[PDB]
């Protein structure tokens, strides 16, 4: 049972990401993915025990990078969280009104 978000992040970057990357053929170089952007996707979207839904997310971003190479202009996408809003679209969860003091 279960998977804590930290462990899921570890598994993904070391197992899912290489796995889906070999399954989708994207070069390791061409579709860079920071741990930060992944952290955002974890904090805001996938908060549940299963691993599959995260697999769907990584595929979505990899897909969008593939089309942008296959027919866009850039020779590589470079996703930063400010860009993410269009790739994942509307965030589901709302970030907390993080008060300071």
């Amino acid at each position: 049972s279960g998977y804590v978000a930290q462990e899921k992040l570890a598994i993904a970057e070391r197992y899912l990401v290489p796995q889906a990357r070999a399954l989708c053929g994207l070069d390791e170089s061409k579709a860079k993915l920071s741990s930060d952007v992944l952290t955002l996707l974890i904090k805001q979207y996938c908060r549940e025990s299963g691993v599959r839904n995260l697999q769907k997310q990584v595929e979505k971003v990899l897909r969008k990078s593939a089309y942008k190479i296959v027919s866009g202009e850039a020779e590589s996408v470079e996703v930063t969280p400010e860009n993410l809003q269009d790739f994942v679209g509307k965030p589901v969860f709302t970030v907390e009104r993080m008060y300071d003091v």
Partner: protein, 250 residues
């Protein structure tokens, strides 16, 4: 002029199998059954079931593939010509053609639209299938409660035939049709082996390659199909089955 009437059919099954890329799971079982058929008399009571079983197994297409139009510039036209809006599905299709264009060989998927009735849910697949130009199909599953349509019977029964999906695949010679299940959420509860339990083994993206219909039990590859499913609301679906498939929201 009854020049070997029992052999011409055995030859026929040869010819139909020559061109095919027979899976290794099949090629032993087939020809050994053709031998067994060659032992027994044409009027032998088993012969007309065996002649059917081969007739199915020789006939269902094996690995023939339909290369699709690839340039997307022309895809836009046909994608727009018969419907307006539905932009997100257009983008997903752009993704699909892009990725399948990337690692050479074709690959399947599953998807699941949902939203208000009459949005066009049933109305797109004919457009999509026209886009890729892979053969279309449609298959409402509303209220179905008999797994046999997905499986067939044991061949001991008179007239048993492999599940309907295979009948489609026979009817569409390419090995990669766009199968289309429809209205999944209104699928019935048969109170004894209801279809959703069956469906999960089919729809699992990874296990589908080894679907094994009970009729002819040899596993079949089925990764190349791109299934699509529809439902007017996304609550009846069992939790894993909802996990299994993409949930586009028309």
């Amino acid at each position: 002029l009854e020049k070997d009437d029992k052999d011409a059919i055995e030859e026929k099954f040869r010819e139909r199998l020559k061109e095919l890329v027979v899976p290794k799971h099949v090629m032993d079982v087939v020809d050994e059954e053709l031998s067994k058929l060659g032992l027994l008399d044409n009027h032998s009571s088993e012969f007309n079931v065996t002649r059917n079983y081969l007739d199915w197994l020789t006939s269902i297409p094996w690995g023939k593939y339909s290369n699709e139009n690839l340039d997307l510039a022309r895809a836009q036209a046909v994608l727009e010509e018969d419907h307006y809006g539905m932009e997100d599905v257009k983008k997903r299709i752009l993704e699909f053609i892009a990725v399948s264009q990337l690692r050479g060989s074709t690959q399947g998927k599953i998807l699941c639209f949902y939203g208000p009735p009459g949005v066009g849910k049933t109305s797109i697949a004919r457009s999509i299938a026209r886009a890729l130009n892979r053969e279309y199909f449609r298959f409402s599953v509303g209220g179905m409660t008999d797994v046999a349509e997905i499986k067939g019977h044991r061949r001991t029964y008179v007239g048993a035939m492999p599940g309907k999906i295979i009948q489609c695949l026979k009817k569409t010679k390419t090995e990669n049709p766009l199968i289309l299940i429809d209205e999944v959420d209104k699928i019935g509860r048969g109170y004894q082996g209801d279809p959703s339990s069956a469906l999960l083994e089919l729809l699992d993206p990874e296990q589908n390659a080894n679907f094994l219909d009970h009729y002819l039990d040899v596993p079949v590859d089925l990764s190349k199909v791109l299934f699509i499913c529809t439902a007017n609301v996304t609550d009846t679906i069992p939790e894993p089955l909802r996990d299994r498939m993409e949930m586009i929201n028309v």
